[PDB]
Design a protein around this ligand. Structure first.
Ligand code: CHL
Ligand code: CLA
Ligand code: CLA
Ligand code: CLA
Ligand code: CLA
Ligand code: CLA
Ligand code: CLA
Ligand SMILES: CC(/C=C/C=C(C)/C=C/[C@@]12O[C@]1(C)C[C@@H](O)CC2(C)C)=C\C=C\C=C(C)\C=C\C=C(C)\C=C\[C@@]12O[C@]1(C)C[C@@H](O)CC2(C)C
Ligand SMILES: CC(/C=C/C=C(C)/C=C/[C@@]12O[C@]1(C)C[C@@H](O)CC2(C)C)=C\C=C\C=C(C)\C=C\C=C(C)\C=C\[C@@]12O[C@]1(C)C[C@@H](O)CC2(C)C
Ligand SMILES: CC1=C[C@H](O)CC(C)(C)[C@H]1/C=C/C(C)=C/C=C/C(C)=C/C=C/C=C(C)/C=C/C=C(C)/C=C/C1=C(C)C[C@H](O)CC1(C)C
Ligand SMILES: CC1=C(/C=C/C(C)=C/C=C/C(C)=C/C=C/C=C(C)/C=C/C=C(C)/C=C/C2=C(C)CCCC2(C)C)C(C)(C)CCC1
Lengths: 204, 81, 205, 225, 216
């Protein structure tokens, strides 16, 4: 009684549908391995969350600049721009901080509920009871979302499909920067100016 | 050079020698010739995939004899003609 | 019994007459497999419907152009005319729009009734039961096609498929005759009405 | 069991004398249409072997009924035999003489228009050979001779022999069909060489459509030598 | 299971055994000297491992130079590094003969120790080496010593995976032996590096083969 991504299409046996967003869409038969499904769901969560973060960080500056509130440079040349700190130094700081963060995440994934305790101050005790959703004061301050059964399903579906939308949108933005030398919203303006003569087939 | 007369003579000599080897028109490892040139059967402990009994030893021997005959014919024809 | 295409000859065993317009014409035995008949009837329905559309579009505008009330250009050069939009853009737009229809058609022919529900508003549906006949408000505006058929539906189906086959022959005739003669179908019609014997296949070559 | 027999058995048999000519081509041991990645599902449960040259390749739901399978086997055999004849006859005149001798026209897809020329069709470019100049006569002779041949095929069956493997004295003068085992092996060989010829004919059609001729595109191009 | 007759002594227990022995070199009837059946598999494995090292190291510098990792002063072909001074020479921190003496010293230690372990299986772990004699006691088969140094990661813990690894080692070793022979012959005929030969066969396959290079 669960809608499928394709009407009248039989869902894969392993794709039960209990997990949020499971619409029986696995054409490549990739997730049939017993040990791969958890890795797939965690990877999709991380991918969608970082993709939507990057989607905000890309779309908001260009939109604000074209409105007029801000006067920030574009994303596809920001790396080659004047900064107080050297680019390599910043990158090393980034990789170190992310090494700590993901190391914690990887330890959580491999060993369930093993790194919920803060070493320096053992009086924190993260509250998350599911892998990939640690919650806690640092990551879930207000406490929204956590409720009864079938309440988490709809909001997690919202999260995963919003992340999918943002991820495909950011792929589109990168493809734009590869094909046109201007921001995607300016391409929206161009598509609005002459819609029947401005599309993908026009200047492929 | 591929279509040249020398190439044709060499390939023809080698092919004819191999043909006379695989089919019982010439001596080989599994087919001994007697004093009367009769080609009696001989059993050798050599295993081959060819159902007729043609082995790699026979392939090498027939190819060598074919190259020899072809070289002789080519040089003789060049000297005469 | 039924009027066969060839009098006095046994009809193919796989054609019982239940399907509309069964003339028992299978000289090459291309319908020996029962599961192939369903696909073949669906394909012939789709070509015959599109062929009736094409015959109307190639004959009525040209006939009214001959009458003078319309200025429709010759259909052979219609695709080379200038239009406000890119023809390839038009192709991709119609492709995208028709992809949903093709998906619906594939889903229903593989599994009848699985796409009979309106997604946005589930209340809206279609009343069809036979495979390839949806009825409903969208596809049957006049409510024609859902009737107790003792002799009602079958005659309509038979004349529908007969007109479809005639239009199929007509459109391939038009394409062929335009290829052979660099003139519109109405020119050939006038030539055959003026002197049928003089103007013919051998007349041009 | 003529002299050609036991000679094919010693030399022309494709398997060693100890092993029968059945197992490599019939039964559950067939190579199958995906090689070592075939998997049990991709072989239809009705394509169990027991017929020449089957690799369990029915991606569409054809056959599945014995009558369709037997028929399709018969058209496959006929198209294959005609394709063998066609490919060898398309490649022989170009091999013997690639020059454009006026009455010759070696190119396989251009010999049709040679009849309408003044020189006509001169077999081997010999002025006195046939020298035909009328297409209608060729049409009539084709119709009569092939109608007689096919009428004899589908009506003059000896009622005791196979419709497509008549054998007998007239169609097997050398008596290759003495042994059923070598007969099945020869049927496998015939099917495979016929399929190869059929693909050769299809590729010949395509490459004639795109590129010029057969010798060129094999000696002119792709084999720069 | 392939190649030639099953010689009735190549039953199949050896890794990489396919009964290929046309000359009957491994027949155990008269098996003295270096033609002992217990020496030939070991020798095959040893020229094979050295050939794997040699092929990888003779093709690596030129590929790295083409990509750009290493300075182009060191991207010279394998025969232009000092093996054959008449062909080409490179200047290192020592002249090649001092390098040869040092190499012979180190390889003499290693190889005479390995030989003593082959001939006296339990030895090399008894007398006092400089603390490392504990890890240098080869377990069982001389060709597969193992231990906390020669197998310091722990592969092949079970027997079947070890069999697969042994078979893989034998095939890569035989392939590398043939590759090194090809390196030698192609160096003699073409006068350029094997990677350049590969690029030449790729650019114009029909006009850049052994038949064209008959004239040097
Ligand atoms: C059986 C397969 C068969 C095929 C595939 C073809 C296909 C062809 N015929 Mg052909 N023919 C075939 C059998 C026969 N033809 C002819 C009589 C002719 C003629 C007179 C001509 C062709 C020509 C052609 C070629 C150009 C087609 C075309 O005009 O448009 C093409 C290769 C034409 C050609 O060669 O132009 C290049 C051409 O003039 N055919 C006869 C005698 C009845 C056939 C008998 O079976
Ligand atoms: C035209 C002459 C001719 C020649 C020179 C050869 C030569 C050879 N054939 Mg052969 N063969 C021929 C005709 C010929 N065949 C014919 C007409 C048939 C059809 C019956 C076969 C069927 C055949 C098979 C089925 C096999 C060979 C194999 C071989 C090789 C055996 C090598 C060996 O010792 O394996 C050890 C050898 C190169 C074997 C091989 O290893 O080929 C690579 C093999 O399996 N042949
Ligand atoms: C088409 C066949 C053919 C032809 C026309 C020739 C022709 C010739 N061969 Mg020749 N040959 C042939 C096949 C042929 N050969 C074959 C199949 C072989 C075996 C490989 C040889 C092996 C052969 C050798 C080894 C020699 C010749 C020599 C000669 C030359 C004759 C010298 C001579 O007889 O002095 C008369 C000699 C005496 C009376 C003693 C002559 C040009 C000789 C040559 O080249 O000399 C310049 C020579 O030394 N031939
Ligand atoms: C995100 C991946 C994805 C992809 C690639 C597709 C791709 C497709 N869907 Mg689809 N679909 C998806 C997710 C996806 N869907 C989801 C999440 C839902 C909601 C459950 C649906 C619900 C849906 C319906 C209801 C239908 C399609 C249909 C189609 C096909 C026609 C659309 C087209 O352009 O062609 C196409 C193969 C149509 C089709 O062909 O069905 C037969 C159709 O009717 N889709
Ligand atoms: C289905 C088989 C088939 C068909 C339809 C043809 C048809 C033709 N062949 Mg042909 N041929 C065939 C098989 C076939 N061949 C085979 C198997 C061989 C090899 C023996 C040849 C060898 C051959 C030669 C050598 C010649 C023909 C020629 C011809 C053409 C005129 C000869 C004639 O009377 O007709 C004609 C287009 C003649 C021609 O002009 O073709 C260009 C010609 O000279 N054929
Ligand atoms: C007339 C010269 C001659 C002959 C006929 C032989 C013959 C033989 N030697 Mg030998 N040998 C020779 C000179 C010769 N040697 C010289 C000059 C040296 C010193 C470098 C050696 C050092 C030598 C060793 C070290 C070994 C042989 C071995 C052998 C035997 C097998 C070798 C093989 O397959 O090749 C065979 C009886 C091997 C043997 O006995 O195995 C059965 C073996 O291990 N030989
Ligand atoms: C076995 C073997 C041997 C005898 C050598 C020997 C050598 N290599 Mg070497 N190499 C090997 C394996 C081997 N390699 C492998 C497996 C790889 C990978 C490399 C990658 C490599 C590089 C990248 C370079 C050498 C270089 C050299 C030369 C100088 C080495 C040095 O300065 O110290 C010397 C001829 C250097 C050279 O030729 O100069 C150099 O730049 N090697
Ligand atoms: C006739 C036809 C097919 C005929 C098939 C036959 C006889 C099959 C017969 C048999 O199989 C049976 C039944 C049963 C078997 O046992 C035996 C045989 C004997 C084998 C298809 C028609 C098909 C006809 C169709 C689909 C018509 C399409 C119309 C189009 C494309 C219009 C195009 C244009 O709009 C554009 C694009 C733009 C501008 O150019 C303007 C126009 C020209 C208006
Ligand atoms: C060890 C070896 C190669 C070692 C290479 C090294 C160290 C290379 C080192 C360097 O390159 C570097 C890295 C960098 C350079 O700057 C310097 C040098 C120093 C140059 C090859 C062995 C190569 C060994 C080979 C090729 C052996 C071939 C044996 C065959 C074919 C045997 C066949 C049969 O024996 C059977 C199997 C069964 C019998 O019954 C019948 C027959 C037919 C006799
Ligand atoms: C298997 C399967 C299975 C699953 O189901 C999937 C699928 C895919 C479906 C399938 C497949 C199939 C296929 C591939 C097929 C193919 C076919 C062909 C190719 C044919 C030909 C065919 C071919 C043919 C007959 C041919 C013929 C020919 C001829 C006669 C010729 C003649 C001639 C000559 C000599 C010469 C001159 O000058 C010219 C002419 C006159 C012309
Ligand atoms: C596998 C196969 C097959 C086959 C194939 C082939 C192709 C074969 C061939 C083979 C061959 C083809 C071989 C050859 C060989 C050759 C040789 C072996 C030669 C040698 C030479 C020599 C020895 C010489 C010497 C000399 C002289 C004497 C003179 C002077 C100079 C010199 C000194 C150099 C078969 C059919 C069965 C099947 C299918 C696949």
């Amino acid at each position: 009684d669960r809608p499928l991504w394709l009407p009248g299409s039989e869902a894969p046996k392993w794709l039960d549908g209990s997990l949020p967003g499971d619409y029986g869409f696995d054409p490549l038969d990739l997730a049939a391995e017993p040990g791969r499904l958890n890795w797939m769901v965690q990877a999709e969560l991380v991918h969608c969350r970082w993709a939507m973060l990057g989607a905000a960080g890309i779309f908001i500056p260009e939109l604000l600049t074209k409105i007029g509130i801000l006067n920030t440079p574009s994303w596809y040349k920001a790396g080659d721009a004047t900064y107080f700190a050297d680019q390599g130094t910043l990158f090393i700081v980034e990789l170190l901080l992310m090494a700590w963060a993901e190391s914690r995440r990887w330890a959580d994934i491999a060993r369930p509920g093993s790194v919920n305790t803060d070493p320096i101050f053992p009086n924190n005790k993260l509250t998350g009871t599911d892998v990939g959703y640690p919650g806690g004061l640092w990551f879930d301050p207000l406490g929204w979302g956590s409720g009864s059964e079938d309440k988490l399903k709809e909001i997690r579906t919202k999260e995963v499909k919003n992340g999918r939308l943002a991820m495909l949108a950011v792929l589109g933005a990168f493809v734009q920067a590869n094909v046109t030398h201007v921001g995607p919203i300016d391409n929206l303006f161009a598509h609005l100016a002459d819609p029947y003569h401005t599309t993908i087939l026009q200047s492929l | 050079y591929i279509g040249s007369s020398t190439n044709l003579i060499m390939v023809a000599s080698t092919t004819l020698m191999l043909f006379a080897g695989r089919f019982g028109l010439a001596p080989s490892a599994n087919r001994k010739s007697t004093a009367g040139l009769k080609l009696v059967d001989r059993d050798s402990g050599l295993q081959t995939g060819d159902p007729a009994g043609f082995t790699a030893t026979d392939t090498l021997a027939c190819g060598a004899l074919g190259h020899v005959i072809g070289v002789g014919i080519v040089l003789g024809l060049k000297a005469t003609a | 019994d039924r009027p066969l295409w060839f009098p006095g000859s046994k009809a193919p065993e796989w054609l019982d007459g239940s399907l509309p317009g069964d003339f028992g014409f299978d000289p090459l035995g291309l319908g020996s497999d029962p599961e192939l008949l369903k696909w073949f009837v669906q394909a012939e329905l789709v070509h015959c419907r599109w062929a009736m559309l094409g015959a109307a579009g190639i004959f009525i505008p040209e006939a009214l152009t001959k009458a003078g009330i319309l200025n429709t250009p010759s259909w052979n050069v219609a695709g080379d005319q200038q239009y406000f939009a890119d023809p390839t853009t038009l192709f991709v737009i119609e492709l995208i729009l028709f992809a949903w229809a093709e998906g619906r058609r594939w889903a229903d022919i593989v599994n009848p009734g699985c796409v009979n529900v309106d997604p946005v508003f589930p209340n809206n549906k279609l009343t069809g039961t036979d495979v390839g006949y949806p009825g409903g408000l969208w596809f049957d505006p006049l409510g024609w096609g859902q009737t107790k058929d003792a002799k009602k539906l079958k005659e309509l189906r038979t004349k529908e498929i007969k007109n479809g086959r005639l239009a199929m022959l007509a459109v391939l005739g038009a394409v062929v005759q335009a290829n052979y003669t660099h003139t519109g179908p109405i020119d050939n019609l006038l030539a055959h009405l003026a002197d049928p014997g003089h103007n013919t296949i051998f007349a041009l070559s | 069991m003529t002299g050609i027999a036991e000679w094919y058995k010693v030399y022309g048999k494709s398997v060693a004398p100890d092993q029968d000519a059945r197992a490599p081509y019939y039964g559950p041991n067939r190579p199958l249409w995906k090689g070592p990645f075939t998997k049990p599902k991709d072989v239809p449960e009705y394509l169990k072997g027991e017929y020449p040259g089957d690799y369990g390749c029915d991606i569409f739901k054809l056959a599945r009924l014995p009558a369709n399978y037997a028929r399709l086997r018969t058209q496959e055999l006929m198209n294959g035999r005609w394709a063998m004849l066609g490919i060898t006859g398309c490649l022989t005149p170009e091999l013997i003489n690639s020059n454009s001798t006026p009455g010759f026209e070696p190119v396989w897809f251009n010999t049709g228009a040679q009849i309408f020329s003044d020189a006509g069709i001169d077999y081997l470019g010999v002025p006195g050979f046939i020298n035909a100049h009328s297409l209608f006569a060729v049409i009539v002779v084709q119709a009569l001779l092939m109608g007689l041949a096919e009428y004899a095929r589908i009506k003059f069956v000896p009622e005791g022999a196979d419709p497509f493997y008549p054998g007998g004295k007239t169609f097997d003068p050398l008596g290759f069909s003495s042994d059923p085992e070598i007969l099945a092996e020869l049927k496998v060989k015939e099917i495979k060489n016929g399929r190869l010829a059929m693909m050769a004919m299809a590729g010949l059609f395509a490459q004639g459509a795109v590129t010029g001729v057969s010798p060129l595109q094999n000696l002119h191009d792709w084999l720069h030598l | 299971f392939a190649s030639k007759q099953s010689l009735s002594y190549l039953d199949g227990t050896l890794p990489g055994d396919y009964g290929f022995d046309p000359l009957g070199l491994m027949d155990p009837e008269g098996a003295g000297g270096f033609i002992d059946p217990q020496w030939l598999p070991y020798a095959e494995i040893i020229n094979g491992r050295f050939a794997m090292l040699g092929a990888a190291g003779a093709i690596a510098p030129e590929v790295l130079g083409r990509i750009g990792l290493i300075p182009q002063e060191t991207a010279i072909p394998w025969f232009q590094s000092g093996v054959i001074p008449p062909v080409g020479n490179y200047s290192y921190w020592a002249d090649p003969y001092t390098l040869f003496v040092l190499e012979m010293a180190l390889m003499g230690f290693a190889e005479h120790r390995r030989a003593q372990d082959y001939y006296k299986p339990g030895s090399m772990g008894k007398q006092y080496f400089l603390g490392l004699e504990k890890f240098l006691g080869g377990s069982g088969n001389p060709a597969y010593p193992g231990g906390p140094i020669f197998n310091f990661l722990g592969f092949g813990k079970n027997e079947k995976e070890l069999q697969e690894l042994k078979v893989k080692e034998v095939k890569n070793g035989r392939l590398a032996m043939m590759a090194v022979l090809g390196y030698f012959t192609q160096a003699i005929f073409t006068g350029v590096g094997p990677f350049q030969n590969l690029l030449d066969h790729l650019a114009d396959p029909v006009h850049n083969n052994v038949l064209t290079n008959l004239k040097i």
